[PDB]
Amino acid sequence: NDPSNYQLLIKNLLFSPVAFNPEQEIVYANHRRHSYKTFHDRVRQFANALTKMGVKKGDTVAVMDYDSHRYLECYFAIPMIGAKLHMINVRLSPEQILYTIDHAEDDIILIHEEFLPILDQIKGRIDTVTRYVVLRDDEECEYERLLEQESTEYNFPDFDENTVATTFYTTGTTGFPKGVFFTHRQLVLHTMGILSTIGTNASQGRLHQGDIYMPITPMFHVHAWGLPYMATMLGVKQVYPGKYVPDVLLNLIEQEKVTFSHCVPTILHLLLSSPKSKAMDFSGWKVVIGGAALPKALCKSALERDIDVFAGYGMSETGPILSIVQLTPEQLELDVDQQAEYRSKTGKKVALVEAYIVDEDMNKLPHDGETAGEIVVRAPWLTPNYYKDNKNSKALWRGGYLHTGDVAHIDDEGFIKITDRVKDMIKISGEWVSSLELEDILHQHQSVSEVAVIGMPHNKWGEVPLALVTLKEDAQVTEKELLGFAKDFINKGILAREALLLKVKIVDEIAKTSVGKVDKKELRKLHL
Amino acid sequence: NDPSNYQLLIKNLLFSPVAFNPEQEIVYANHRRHSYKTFHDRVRQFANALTKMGVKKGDTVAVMDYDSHRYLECYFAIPMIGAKLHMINVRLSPEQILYTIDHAEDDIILIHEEFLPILDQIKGRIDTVTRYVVLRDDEECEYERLLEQESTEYNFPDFDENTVATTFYTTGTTGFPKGVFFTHRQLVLHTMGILSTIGTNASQGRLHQGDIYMPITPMFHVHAWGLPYMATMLGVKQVYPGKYVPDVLLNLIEQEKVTFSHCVPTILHLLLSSPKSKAMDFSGWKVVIGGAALPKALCKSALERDIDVFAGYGMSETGPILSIVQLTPEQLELDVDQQAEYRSKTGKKVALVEAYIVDEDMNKLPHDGETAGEIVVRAPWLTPNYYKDNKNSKALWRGGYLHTGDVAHIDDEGFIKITDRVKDMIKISGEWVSSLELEDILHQHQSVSEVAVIGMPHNKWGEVPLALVTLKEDAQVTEKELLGFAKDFINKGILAREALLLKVKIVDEIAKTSVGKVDKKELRKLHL
Amino acid sequence: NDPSNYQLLIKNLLFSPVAFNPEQEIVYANHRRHSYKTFHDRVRQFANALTKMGVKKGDTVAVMDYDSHRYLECYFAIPMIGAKLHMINVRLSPEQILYTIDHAEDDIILIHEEFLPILDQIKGRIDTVTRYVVLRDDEECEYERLLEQESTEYNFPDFDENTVATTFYTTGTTGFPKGVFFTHRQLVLHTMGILSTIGTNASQGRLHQGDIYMPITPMFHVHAWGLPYMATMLGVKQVYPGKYVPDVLLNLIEQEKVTFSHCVPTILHLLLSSPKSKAMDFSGWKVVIGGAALPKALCKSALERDIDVFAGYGMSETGPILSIVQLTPEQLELDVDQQAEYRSKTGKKVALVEAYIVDEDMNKLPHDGETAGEIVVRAPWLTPNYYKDNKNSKALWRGGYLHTGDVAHIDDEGFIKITDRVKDMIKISGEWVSSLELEDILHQHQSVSEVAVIGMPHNKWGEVPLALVTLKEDAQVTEKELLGFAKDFINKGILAREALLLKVKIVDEIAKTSVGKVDKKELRKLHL
Ligand SMILES: CCCCCCCC/C=C\CCCCCCCC(=O)O
Ligand SMILES: CCCCCCCC/C=C\CCCCCCCC(=O)O
Numbered sequence A, B, C: 001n002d003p004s005n006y007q008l009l010i011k012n013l014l015f016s017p018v019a020f021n022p023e024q025e026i027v028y029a030n031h032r033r034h035s036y037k038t039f040h041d042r043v044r045q046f047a048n049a050l051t052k053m054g055v056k057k058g059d060t061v062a063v064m065d066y067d068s069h070r071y072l073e074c075y076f077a078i079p080m081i082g083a084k085l086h087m088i089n090v091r092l093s094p095e096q097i098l099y100t101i102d103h104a105e106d107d108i109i110l111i112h113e114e115f116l117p118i119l120d121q122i123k124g125r126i127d128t129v130t131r132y133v134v135l136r137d138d139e140e141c142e143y144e145r146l147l148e149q150e151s152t153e154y155n156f157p158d159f160d161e162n163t164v165a166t167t168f169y170t171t172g173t174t175g176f177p178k179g180v181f182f183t184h185r186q187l188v189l190h191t192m193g194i195l196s197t198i199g200t201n202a203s204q205g206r207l208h209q210g211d212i213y214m215p216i217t218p219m220f221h222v223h224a225w226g227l228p229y230m231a232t233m234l235g236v237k238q239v240y241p242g243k244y245v246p247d248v249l250l251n252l253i254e255q256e257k258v259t260f261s262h263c264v265p266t267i268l269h270l271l272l273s274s275p276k277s278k279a280m281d282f283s284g285w286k287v288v289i290g291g292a293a294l295p296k297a298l299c300k301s302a303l304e305r306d307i308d309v310f311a312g313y314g315m316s317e318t319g320p321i322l323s324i325v326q327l328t329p330e331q332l333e334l335d336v337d338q339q340a341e342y343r344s345k346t347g348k349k350v351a352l353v354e355a356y357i358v359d360e361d362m363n364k365l366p367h368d369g370e371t372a373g374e375i376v377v378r379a380p381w382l383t384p385n386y387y388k389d390n391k392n393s394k395a396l397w398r399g400g401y402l403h404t405g406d407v408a409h410i411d412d413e414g415f416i417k418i419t420d421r422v423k424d425m426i427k428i429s430g431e432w433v434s435s436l437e438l439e440d441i442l443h444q445h446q447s448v449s450e451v452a453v454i455g456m457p458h459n460k461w462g463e464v465p466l467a468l469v470t471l472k473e474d475a476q477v478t479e480k481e482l483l484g485f486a487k488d489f490i491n492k493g494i495l496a497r498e499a500l501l502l503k504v505k506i507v508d509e510i511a512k513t514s515v516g517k518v519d520k521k522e523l524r525k526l527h528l
């Protein structure tokens, strides 16, 4: 190694941070508190313990627990040693978890006690794993016992910045989960690009060195949006809640004085509706809602409590952060409604992101605010391919750009608004129509609980619209009324307003995926 | 090139910035104003004009003018084409300028009209340069004429991120100027590391997207501390003053509402003493004084006008930025005096900087706040060596660290305070004493104008102190009185307070370098 | 390519065979007959059809049907083009079939009509396959239609002999099926090594150029033991039965005068028990029983009909053929019983096979006829590793030898007799005992239908024996009687004859794998 040749490694985020206070605190909710000095000591102890277990440079260590100090220590100790960190989506079915464990070829597994029953259905079909480390919360944690017998001194190696650091296996539509991976250089660049793009905001949505961080994202998904790295680089106080409960998170916010966090719309809705929330001070909090498509009504309800709500976009192949809503001081003067419409957009692209919209032939459509197409991006922190995949990898990076899979339009100003998914487009004859805009119109009815819209083939206009609706409790309206409910609107293309092809049907129960996302593929299977 | 393999290039700072407003302004003081859209068009036009002139990838283009929009366009167009940008220190002697021109082997030269007389002494000894482009301010600029006949469309090439981008030839003690160079990757990393480290400040010293930038640094020195790149990445309004005049800078500050700038202590003293400054509002301005050793009295005088003054450290081999003073909100409550003492320090190291202090054997002395040693650093933006140099390059990177040449001590908190230079240490017997702390003590006298302290060899205690002083107008005190003036103090090592070895001498005139820095090498030559 | 440098390719088996008669016949049972000239023409036509479909050198084509002329044409046309041939085990569960299809990344799929329902559960989760070719038997086959429109001329390419030719995904104990692959060189060497080792037999078990071949092995398992290649190299008449039915195979044997075949003990038992078999002439037939552990009583019953029965050993990682029973003329004089005992052995190793037996430390135990150990082999036709596997691949080739997984002893003469599996050994205290020898002893009882023996942990003697038995119809004997039934025998180690640790249990139904092999892993799960 040439000392004059600098490698961008994860250890430089921890030992060469923006700020470091040895008496700043790390809090595991109502369980444990220590300082940054103790946190560094524990990272070195964990490196020693891993080295004793026989974890070499190329090895893979799989982690399975909640949000805690242990996960934060794994986010650092494992990559610095040179090993790979495999975050396991504990919400997948045990068959898919077994598939990802086999595909990644883990050597050690750190599994929380509460997830032991899952392992009891899978353990007989695992070959690569040689050690199971059972994580507990009170006193009998094997992780704590392993730490306790190791020294707080360790000389972290210097290797190439292109060595892989993390993998986490997103599940999309392929049939088997696809493994995405990142390197030390990519994570370091992601932390500094996002800190530079949104830490430099004028006044509204900025993360600074006086914030108190607390994740409300599962932290095995996408590195928790890269936020633990950014928060530890800034040397801010961090609070970890463990298992998400709406009324324990509210207590943590009130008592630890959390100012910055991030979640998905469902958790935000659960928090704002909780009985204790009504008697709480929220006007210091800056939640980031980047899970999926922040609704405007939820944004309006969160704005009336004086919460800095804004949306972001990421994809789990992309770092994930690609775009963030940032409001100019001219826009910070509008009323709630216009602000709600601005804050719920996909947002403008962050530093070092290209973000074009193309058609099926990669033609780079104009940014006029109306024309829709699929977003293709280039960024310093994208996965080159899928792990152990060839054809899907080629379909991902087709034409020299990473294909996101979302259909959106971009304003002249730069604001992006995702309209639909590429696979959910209705190919009626010779035009493309979003199926998302139809679902919410049916959702506006007083006797519908959930709407899923798919497309059935039809000889002359190709695949046409078809709506599957589940009615509410003690509500019974025939499909004829529902057909006329949507016909009341105007301003649609093709035949008048697209009326005679709806063919709405009433469904007792709608198939959902393991996580809870509506499964529009098997819906096509059982309806076709 | 692999599209999935991202290269960190300068064109990504311009076309993938943090923010971009096409109607944001670039102002050349009282001469010209255009917008960011026009600025991008002019960058493409300049790329076209350079391509027509025959500037290939490896070529070098030398620039010689003041701070203007033209220099900002050269900071971008030349590196993107692939060529090298050579900034010429217009304050060196024409012999040294000729040496640097010959050493760099420039092909084109862009020289301002006012610097033409300098060229008239040098032009007969230049072989490599084939074109001279004369820059003017009113209407007959050849740069403007070259731009006017070129199209605003250009496809900038994609090359390796390790291609050299800039060189500027620092002059130290070697005898000939030494050429330092940086690459695209290093400049991109410098812009994002500094933006992340000081844009994320809580409240005090932060550069954000609502600032108005105006350099007061020569902009050929060290890339103007990297600040034009950071300011154009943030998409802020920029004001360029041209030739520094104290009362034109004040008018620019008042009228364009500048909030962020950077200079050296002499310019700040000249501004604060100007008659028009007294009737001006300064409480929105955040000058950064990182030239050399911000005095505490100047800091105190600037703090009473409510100016956010803070210091930084750089070296012209180092990017340059290495450390910045950043105050915690606990420290933003002290009175002026304690704040003056905090703001005039060298400061804490920025993100991704290592910054140890070692002895002559590279032993990494402790950080106790008292022990002094030479600072050695590792950072992503340091020159690997000197251009076309071998032995000096080896002396620079000795022991795997870049040697700065400054002697400082570091607190436990992290604050650095530079005490002296390595070459100016007095090697009295077996201990090292700073010669800087003695000079200011003599400066406190009422009849001394300037003090320079060097060291004469002496058999038993080695090199010993020796002070050369120039008296004021109509002041005549013999060296005996001056010897007793310093003896009044206490708390020094060695023989009592170091009294019998001063041997102060009175000098009519003190030799100064070309820029204006006291020349302690020839002072030794004429006194030894 | 150097013409003087010979590459061992599969096309040389077809175009440079031992013998070639253009009027020799290929028979698809009661469906089709053509000659070897037509067969060569059809191979060239299929090469043309595959080239039109866009199958390049690296592509994979997956085949799913019965034993037919189409499978024989796929055994040649696909490898010669350079593509990979993926044989799909149609007897696995559709989940495992989907896993193997995804893992192999097939481009085309040739699937028989009868296997279409299986595809109906899997098709929605397949991404790589772009064409489905439906095979039928009467007139509407898409394979026949694709052939009919292509020319019978094709120039087969010359490539490296180390290019992969076939893959078929064995399923063992890992939890997911493991993919094994072979090259052109390995298949050519396998065909010539086996032809040289058993074609040169003195009189008994020899395949010569006057035989009539007919497979009774699924032909997707292990290349049908490499026998179609050997039979087409010799240019003999070949009969393909399609779907195995006991009374259609007997008709084929009687009418086409088949002399050489190969099956597994179950099919041989089904044939010898069929009502039509009793009135048939069998004294020209040379079935090879190499499926799993030819029983001695079945061998004795097949010997009384004057059938040349002998056993072979293979493993699906090994070519497969490793050993064959070959009788010297001295041994061809013993009565049925001694001949039955000789013919049911694993046999002596074939040409170019090493075949040691080692212990757990790879110590190469002696060949005394009593000492047992695991067989480790070296041969020219073994898979280097598992496809896309690292740790299992290392466990397979541990110590420089391929580990078979079987425990056997070898006589001084050279005869091998497999006693058990490595994973099924009972680790009673400090000795290893085969669990297979116990099962047949219990099977000798008049009121037991099937016995499975596993091992339960026990503190002082480690894992101990445990027998699970299912009783016959209208038979009810308690476990106490069964315990005494086995105690009647003698000559066993450890405690007397291993009596007090049996702990036999009665089970209503025993878990079986997908193919029909007893699942001793889940039996441990539900009993432990
Ligand atoms: C101050 C900067 C810190 C905040 C950065 C913004 C947080 C990122 C929010 C938007 C990106 C959304 C990422 C999640 C999408 C992937 C889906 C998932 O893994 O759950
Ligand atoms: C918001 C960040 C922008 C401000 C960054 C701080 C500016 C840098 C000031 C301290 C570094 C001093 C660099 C000059 C030292 C080299 C000497 C020279 O070339 O003149």
Ligand SMILES: CCCCCCCC/C=C\CCCCCCCC(=O)O
Pocket: C194, C195, C198, C199, C206, C207, C221, C222, C225, C227, C230, C262, C288, C289, C290, C291, C311, C312, C313, C314, C315, C316, C320, C321, C322, C324
């Ligand atoms: C004249 C030589 C032709 C006969 C060669 C002998 C045939 C091979 C018989 C013994 C090998 C058994 C191979 C099957 C074991 C693998 C299991 C399977 O795939 O079904």
